[PDB]
């Protein structure tokens, strides 16, 4: 044999070793060809949906989602006892490669071992190809190890005007890159070292941004309490007062909450929503080169005010979906909606205004006038939390290679990397297909929980009530399932 079967996790000090071994089956895509693809074939009825690009015969491996590397238990173990984590090393092995050739005479096909076939598999470490991993697409290794999966088909999109290309478009030939070729006695391994990244914050702040103050003392600062003495003409006056625990709205604070871009508000009780088709017109959306595009998920913002759980920001959520969910027009309870509310202390709510500002200058003939600030970007002195990472969410994304950026952490959450884990492309050699094994390993560094807090934490736990099936487990028919999206913010720190 060309490799062994390793799946497990080792817990050593601050380190976690995540070992997954999966079994893949790769067919031949595009009948061994490259193909133009565009909107007009599929019908291209939108200027926002207009695209041009090429689908290539190759497949690729994608482990970029968490449920690959962490069993639901080891996720629970990690979340409850840690204040942060991040990847250190990467180790990937390809082995036990097989190539089956297909012969179908009339009704029934016969599949037999072809021993001399080769498999072409290379890794692009210079990021010369288009890199599609940071887009949260399907095709990643199945959460549950016994399941066998179909390796995705690679493809890419280059620049376009409508469906038509432009002279600055590009065409990348995956045959142009030197690629080791593997037979049933060959095995391909490489390793990778993660670049410096900040520990993911996996805690909920105990205190909010505006309650940082001491409740027992006054401030020495003063504020303007009264602009008139009473009812009548000529009451203009200036009165002042100490900012104190009596009125805490006004106390001078060092820090202020982060950015906001307002999302429309949708209720999960369908009769509180307006009787109109506001799904597309209503939603926030950013425009690029004349193409409109939705704002999704957007800046990291609390999902709803405290105490209001039937509301979710229209486009501003990560909405996963339950096992078995249909592709199109599925009912609202077929999907799972994540909520970021744990950040609501530091970050504004997505469906509310960040604040107000004063429009005019008051006089005897003018009232002080204010207006709603809908979208407020970074100002010096802001603090915020990023979006959480979930068992079902992405791990990393590639930071676009550009003049500059601010807070490179990706807006769907996870660890942004300029040199993320490289893409691994594979194909059959030019009716035949391959099957083989994959063992990927990551080494994670942990941040241990330091708290002196007296009273016990919120922990993640499996609820205690009899049910037909154990959660995070197979049903009777064999289909694995993930009942709900498990974020990591449970323990607590001071602000």
């Amino acid at each position, epitope marked *: 044999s060309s490799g062994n079967w390793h799946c497990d996790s080792q817990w050593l000090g601050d380190r976690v070793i995540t070992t997954s071994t999966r079994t893949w089956a790769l067919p031949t895509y595009n009948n061994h060809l490259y193909k133009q693809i565009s909107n007009s074939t599929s019908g291209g009825s939108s200027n926002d949906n207009a695209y041009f690009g090429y689908s290539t015969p190759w497949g690729y491996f994608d482990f970029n989602r968490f449920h690959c590397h962490f069993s639901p238990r080891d996720w629970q173990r990690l979340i409850n006892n840690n204040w942060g984590f991040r990847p250190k090393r990467l180790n990937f092995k390809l082995f036990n490669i097989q190539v089956k050739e297909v012969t179908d005479n009339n009704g029934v096909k016969t599949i037999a071992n072809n021993l001399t076939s080769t498999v072409q598999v290379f890794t692009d470490s210079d990021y010369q190809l288009p890199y599609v991993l940071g887009s949260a697409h399907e095709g990643c290794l199945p959460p549950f190890p016994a399941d066998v999966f179909m390796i995705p088909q690679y493809g890419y999109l280059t620049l376009n005007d409508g469906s038509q290309a432009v002279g600055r478009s590009s065409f990348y030939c995956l045959e142009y890159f030197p690629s080791q070729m593997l037979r049933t006695g060959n095995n391909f391994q490489f390793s990778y070292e993660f670049e410096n990244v900040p520990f993911h914050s996996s805690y909920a702040h105990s205190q909010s941004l505006d309650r940082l103050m001491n409740p027992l003392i006054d401030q020495y600062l003063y504020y303007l309490s009264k602009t008139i003495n009473g009812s009548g003409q000529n009451q203009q006056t200036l009165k002042f007062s100490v900012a104190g625990p009596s009125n805490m709205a006004v106390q001078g604070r060092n820090y202020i909450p982060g950015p906001s871009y307002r999302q429309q508000r949708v209720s999960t009780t369908v*009769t509180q929503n307006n009787n109109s088709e506001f799904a597309w017109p209503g939603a926030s959306s950013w425009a690029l080169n004349g193409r409109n595009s939705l704002m999704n998920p957007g800046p990291a913002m609390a999902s709803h005010k405290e105490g209001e759980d039937r509301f979710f920001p229209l486009s501003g959520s990560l909405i996963f979906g339950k096992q078995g969910t249909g592709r199109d027009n599925v009912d609202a309870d077929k999907v799972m909606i994540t909520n970021e509310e744990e950040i609501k202390t530091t970050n504004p709510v997505a469906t509310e205004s960040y604040g107000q500002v004063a429009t005019n200058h008051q006089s005897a003939q003018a009232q002080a006038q204010t207006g709603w600030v809908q979208n407020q970007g970074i100002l010096p002195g802001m603090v915020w939390q990023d979006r959480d990472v979930y068992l079902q969410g992405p791990i990393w994304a590639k930071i676009p290679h550009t003049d500059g950026n601010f807070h490179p952490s990706p807006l769907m959450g996870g660890f942004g990397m300029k040199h993320p884990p490289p893409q691994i492309l594979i194909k059959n050699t030019p009716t035949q297909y391959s099957t083989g094994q994959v063992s990927v390993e990551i080494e994670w560094e942990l941040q241990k929980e330091n708290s002196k807090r007296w009273n016990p934490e919120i922990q993640y736990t499996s*609820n205690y009530y009899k*049910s037909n099936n154990v959660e995070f487990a197979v049903n009777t028919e064999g289909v694995y399932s993930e009942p709900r999206p498990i974020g990591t913010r449970y323990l607590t720190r001071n602000l």
Partner: antibody
Amino acid sequence: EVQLVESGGGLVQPGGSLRLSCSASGFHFSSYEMNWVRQAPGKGLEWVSYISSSGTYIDYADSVKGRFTISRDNPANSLYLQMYSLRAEDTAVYYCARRLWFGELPYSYYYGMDVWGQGTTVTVSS
Amino acid sequence: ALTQPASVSGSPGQSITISCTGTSSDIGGYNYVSWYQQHPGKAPELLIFDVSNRPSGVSNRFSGSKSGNTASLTISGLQAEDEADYHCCSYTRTSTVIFGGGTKLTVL
């Protein structure tokens, strides 16, 4: 040790008014919803109204709708149902009940009513 | 509302099943149902929440099922304690709950 006990009221005249109050003891009252359901003497349960923990959502099944209000005081652990323009169509044992909760994070809902009040009889008769 | 029989009877030892039928907004579409036993002059006690889920206090013999556009309570191993009136509860499309006429169980 979870105890929902409501005082409420007895016999009252048609067209009159009544105020039912409930007392939650042994469990955290501010998290749960609360329901008012009624069982007419010979007939099955009917759900009059529910109130959210924060009080943001208060919805009435439409028989009453418009003639009752619902209120809850979280520091006082007490749910209130005040009713006006009573009819004979409203004579029932009124229950103070709460819906299932499991103490988790937001966007988690459970459908069923965990604990029930022992009831108060309301007789609206001319 | 939810339509369920007026009454059901069974002999001790044998499992029997009550059903409550509803519109696609009440049950057919949404998976919300729940079941309650009640004894005369006692506050109802929850048996089954969601469809098949059951609370810790409640006994084994009570299970639940949804065959679609319908929901059913299957009691096993009838005893004298099991005599009670069983109710069907399902939150609707508008998130306002509805019940059904109640069904008395008479153990012979």
